[PDB]
């Protein structure tokens, strides 16, 4: 849904493609340490 809208706005048609919804890290240590990158 909304793929063409996202395209004309400048975002990925599928939000899983790129952007902060997928590129950010999905887990880090509670002490504030950065987790290693995901293979994806």
């Amino acid at each position: 849904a909304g793929g063409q809208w996202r395209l004309q706005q400048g975002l990925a048609a599928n939000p899983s493609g790129y952007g902060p919804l997928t590129e950010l890290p999905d887990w880090s240590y509670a002490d504030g340490r950065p987790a290693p990158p995901m293979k994806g």
């Binding site: 909304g2 809208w5 996202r6 939000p15």
Partner: protein, 99 residues
Amino acid sequence: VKCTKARYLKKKNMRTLWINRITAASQEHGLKYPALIGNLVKCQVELNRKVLADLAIYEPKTFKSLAALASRRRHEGFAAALGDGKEPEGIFSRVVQYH
């Protein structure tokens, strides 16, 4: 083979009953599923159908708030259809630019 082939059917059936629950909840709040999802996407909320259904079930107040948001976005879209430019864009129709 049926155990294998039933997996994607499970996927589809659950998606269908999620969307049906959501359509019902919206229609009893006064909205329709297509406009609801379009408005939410335009307002930048990526809530998939399963959590939308769980929200509509367990916390109807929050689902009602989401429906209100979607309706206001519909009305902003109608004002924009009247005048695309030459006007102040909708407050919720505004988007965030990332880089």
